[PDB]
Design a protein around this motif. Structure first.
Motif, PDB file in Angstrom:
ATOM      1  N   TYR A  56       0.815  -1.320   0.064  1.00 32.29           N
ATOM      2  CA  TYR A  56       0.017  -0.004   0.042  1.00 32.29           C
ATOM      3  C   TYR A  56       0.819   1.122  -0.009  1.00 32.29           C
ATOM      4  N   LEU A  57       2.165   1.175   0.401  1.00 33.72           N
ATOM      5  CA  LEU A  57       2.903   2.581   0.669  1.00 33.72           C
ATOM      6  C   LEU A  57       4.347   2.242   0.224  1.00 33.72           C
ATOM      7  N   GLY A  58       4.734   1.156  -0.647  1.00 37.02           N
ATOM      8  CA  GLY A  58       6.002   0.837  -1.238  1.00 37.02           C
ATOM      9  C   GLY A  58       7.090   0.928  -0.384  1.00 37.02           C
ATOM     10  N   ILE A  59       6.808   0.511   0.868  1.00 37.93           N
ATOM     11  CA  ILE A  59       7.854   0.784   2.072  1.00 37.93           C
ATOM     12  C   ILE A  59       8.657  -0.677   1.825  1.00 37.93           C
ATOM     13  N   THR A  60       9.949  -0.606   1.667  1.00 36.52           N
ATOM     14  CA  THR A  60      10.679  -1.508   1.301  1.00 36.52           C
ATOM     15  C   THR A  60      11.626  -1.717   2.659  1.00 36.52           C
ATOM     16  N   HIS A  61      11.508  -0.830   3.354  1.00 31.99           N
ATOM     17  CA  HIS A  61      12.360  -1.016   4.697  1.00 31.99           C
ATOM     18  C   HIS A  61      11.362  -0.558   5.812  1.00 31.99           C
ATOM     19  N   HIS A  62      10.657  -1.565   6.481  1.00 35.13           N
ATOM     20  CA  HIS A  62       9.899  -1.307   7.617  1.00 35.13           C
ATOM     21  C   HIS A  62      10.601  -1.410   9.104  1.00 35.13           C
ATOM     22  N   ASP A  63      11.166  -0.100   9.311  1.00 34.28           N
ATOM     23  CA  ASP A  63      11.935  -0.130  10.656  1.00 34.28           C
ATOM     24  C   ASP A  63      11.170  -0.044  11.707  1.00 34.28           C
ATOM     25  N   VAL A  64      10.553  -1.243  12.426  1.00 35.44           N
ATOM     26  CA  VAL A  64       9.996  -1.053  13.591  1.00 35.44           C
ATOM     27  C   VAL A  64      10.987  -1.351  14.603  1.00 35.44           C
ATOM     28  N   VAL A  65      10.859  -0.179  15.639  1.00 29.98           N
ATOM     29  CA  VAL A  65      11.611  -0.527  16.810  1.00 29.98           C
ATOM     30  C   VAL A  65      10.937  -0.337  17.977  1.00 29.98           C
ATOM     31  N   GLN A  66      11.558  -0.772  19.012  1.00 26.15           N
ATOM     32  CA  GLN A  66      11.261  -0.674  20.514  1.00 26.15           C
ATOM     33  C   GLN A  66      11.085   0.749  20.912  1.00 26.15           C
ATOM     34  N   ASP A  67      10.003   1.246  21.249  1.00 26.41           N
ATOM     35  CA  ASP A  67       9.771   2.669  21.375  1.00 26.41           C
ATOM     36  C   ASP A  67      10.731   3.181  22.877  1.00 26.41           C
ATOM     37  N   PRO A  68      11.534   4.012  22.622  1.00 29.30           N
ATOM     38  CA  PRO A  68      12.562   4.501  23.773  1.00 29.30           C
ATOM     39  C   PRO A  68      12.082   5.488  24.685  1.00 29.30           C
ATOM     40  N   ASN A  69      10.834   5.957  24.657  1.00 29.11           N
ATOM     41  CA  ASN A  69      10.413   7.208  25.574  1.00 29.11           C
ATOM     42  C   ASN A  69       9.772   6.400  26.579  1.00 29.11           C
ATOM     43  N   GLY A  70       9.459   5.291  26.884  1.00 29.11           N
ATOM     44  CA  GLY A  70       8.883   4.309  27.993  1.00 29.11           C
ATOM     45  C   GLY A  70       7.299   5.208  28.459  1.00 29.11           C
ATOM     46  N   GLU A  71       6.629   5.749  27.619  1.00 29.45           N
ATOM     47  CA  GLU A  71       5.335   6.357  27.716  1.00 29.45           C
ATOM     48  C   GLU A  71       4.397   5.438  27.251  1.00 29.45           C
ATOM     49  N   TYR A  72       2.969   5.937  27.415  1.00 25.50           N
ATOM     50  CA  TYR A  72       1.867   5.014  27.045  1.00 25.50           C
ATOM     51  C   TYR A  72       1.599   5.187  25.569  1.00 25.50           C
ATOM     52  N   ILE A  73       2.059   6.391  24.890  1.00 25.87           N
ATOM     53  CA  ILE A  73       1.567   6.599  23.451  1.00 25.87           C
ATOM     54  C   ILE A  73       2.221   5.718  22.363  1.00 25.87           C
ATOM     55  N   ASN A  74       3.835   5.544  22.661  1.00 22.63           N
ATOM     56  CA  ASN A  74       4.520   5.040  21.839  1.00 22.63           C
ATOM     57  C   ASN A  74       4.247   5.392  20.151  1.00 22.63           C
ATOM     58  N   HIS A  75       4.606   6.817  20.176  1.00 18.88           N
ATOM     59  CA  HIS A  75       4.493   7.400  18.707  1.00 18.88           C
ATOM     60  C   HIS A  75       6.018   7.909  18.280  1.00 18.88           C
ATOM     61  N   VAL A  76       6.500   7.428  17.317  1.00 15.04           N
ATOM     62  CA  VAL A  76       7.509   8.019  16.860  1.00 15.04           C
ATOM     63  C   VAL A  76       7.995   9.343  16.947  1.00 15.04           C
ATOM     64  N   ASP A  77       6.776  10.070  16.680  1.00 14.97           N
ATOM     65  CA  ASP A  77       6.878  11.692  16.445  1.00 14.97           C
ATOM     66  C   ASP A  77       7.145  12.353  17.935  1.00 14.97           C
ATOM     67  N   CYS A  78       7.100  11.653  19.054  1.00 16.74           N
ATOM     68  CA  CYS A  78       7.427  12.071  20.352  1.00 16.74           C
ATOM     69  C   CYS A  78       8.738  11.798  20.708  1.00 16.74           C
TER      70      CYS A  78
END
Ligand SMILES: NC(=[NH2+])NCCC[C@H](N)C(=O)O
Ligand code: MET
Ligand SMILES: [Cl-]
Ligand code: NA
Length: 417
Positions: free
Chosen positions: A174-196
């Motif tokens: 759907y998005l042409g993503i060839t490298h889906h880099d899913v990482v363990q959220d480093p913020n330790g908050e409830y939200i787990n959004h990359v943009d934080c």
């Protein structure tokens, strides 16, 4: 409710936030200050989501009373549950060589009106929509525009009935993503959004949140920064890793890149804000960096600020330049694919360059080898000469684009070695 569809006819390419935007999506009742809407409308089209004609007229009165540029204001009438337009609005992708499409998903919140909104967005924009059957949120998504996407681990854990491989395949289809880099959220908050905690500022630049040495997430964030610092970006160089120090949970990574302007939420103290704004200025020459204070009633939060309450809108008639630059110590031939999603007449396609930083940039026409494929060879230079260059293109629909987007203030640099 979300409706699955077949993916778009390929090849597919997700559009990054620092690519050309035709507008920005906000919602009423507002979660942003009027001063921000006024600043956005000064140069860009602001699309406001309202639930009715009556709410549209109320907003018109507020905009009129605040001196907002009404000629840059439009509306979508659709019910919404929240002002987090970042999280539930559709994602943009180029597909079938000349089209811009919208990708819908299952919004990871119990907000059925917000979840339904991309259908109204695609209708308003006059673009096709595709339903990717994944539980997702825009706040937890960013793409470099070259097939890479960074997301926190909830992209897997909130899609637990699917294997990681099936989740990756949906992002590719759907998005042409060839490298889906899913990482363990480093913020330790409830939200787990990359943009934080993270933001691509360019295909070769990433901003990573920094916290004081004593903060419990200090090592997790240092490890995340080291992880990006050691890896090769889309352009073949290691990422330039920038750090914005949050002394007291200031959401400095939760900024909006809209064309040549960057809107950075600021919460104070002023010295800490100034340092963060100066990191953006250093990282992004040529961009206008704007510090935005929060609305007293809906203030900026560590987990929810300016990026969370906005969403850039791609240009359906986008004059797109695809280019892998020649950089650093270095055949000195550049190639670029130039395609018009408006099917407009592309002319001229130029390479602007400067040698040893002397004088003004000089333009040279690129050669069209095959349809939409342009080349230019650097010739007659001396060993140890330093080159700055960028690509420029225009079409007969009035569009003008450079690669990199900002053009002359941040050119590609290489040395004749
Ligand atoms: N992109 C973002 N940071 N979004 C923040 C959303 C905050 C909201 N309270 C929620 O958890 O849904
Ligand atoms: C689960 S905490 C959610 C915080 C805020 N109400 C948003 O949504
Ligand atoms: Cl279908
Ligand atoms: Na949805």
């Amino acid at each position: 409710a979300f409706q699955e569809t077949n993916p778009p006819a390929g090849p597919v390419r997700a559009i990054a936030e620092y690519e050309r935007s035709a507008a920005v999506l906000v919602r009423y009742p507002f979660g942003i200050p009027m001063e921000l809407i006024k600043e956005l409308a000064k140069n860009d089209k602001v699309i406001t989501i309202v639930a009715s004609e009556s709410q549209k007229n109320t907003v018109i009165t507020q905009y009129t009373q605040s001196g907002v540029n009404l000629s840059n204001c439009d509306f979508i009438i659709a019910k919404t549950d929240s002002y987090w337009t970042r999280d539930y609005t559709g994602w943009f992708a180029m597909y079938d060589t000349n089209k811009v499409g919208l990708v819908d998903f299952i919004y990871n919140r119990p907000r059925p009106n917000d979840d339904e909104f991309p259908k109204y967005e695609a209708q308003y924009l006059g673009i096709e929509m595709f339903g990717m059957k994944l539980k997702q949120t825009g706040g937890n998504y960013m793409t470099d525009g070259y097939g890479s996407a960074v997301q926190s681990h909830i992209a897997y854990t909130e899609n637990s009935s699917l294997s990681q491989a099936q989740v990756n395949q949906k992002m590719k289809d759907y998005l042409g993503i060839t490298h889906h880099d899913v990482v363990q959220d480093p913020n330790g908050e409830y939200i787990n959004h990359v943009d934080c905690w993270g933001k691509y500022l360019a295909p070769n630049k990433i901003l990573i949140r920094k916290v004081p040495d004593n903060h419990p997430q200090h090592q997790a964030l240092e490890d995340m920064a080291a992880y990006f610092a050691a890896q090769t970006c889309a352009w073949g160089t290691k990422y330039e890793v920038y750090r914005a120090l949050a002394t007291n949970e200031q959401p400095y990574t939760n900024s909006l890149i809209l064309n040549n302007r960057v809107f950075v939420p600021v919460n104070g103290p002023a010295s800490v804000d100034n340092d963060a704004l100066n990191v953006y200025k250093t990282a992004m020459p040529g961009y206008e960096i704007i510090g935005v204070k929060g609305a007293s009633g809906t203030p900026w939060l560590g987990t929810d600020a300016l990026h969370a309450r906005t969403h850039e809108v791609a240009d359906k008639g986008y004059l797109y330049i695809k280019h892998y630059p020649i950089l650093g110590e270095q055949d000195y031939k550049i190639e670029a694919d130039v395609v018009s999603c408006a099917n407009a007449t592309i002319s001229p396609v130029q390479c602007y360059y400067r040698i040893n930083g002397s004088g003004s940039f000089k333009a040279a026409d690129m050669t069209m080898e095959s349809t939409g494929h342009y080349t230019y060879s650097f010739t007659g230079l001396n060993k140890n000469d330093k080159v700055e260059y960028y690509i420029s293109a225009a079409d007969n629909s009035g569009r003008k684009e450079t690669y990199p987007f900002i053009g002359e203030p941040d050119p590609f640099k290489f040395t004749c070695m």
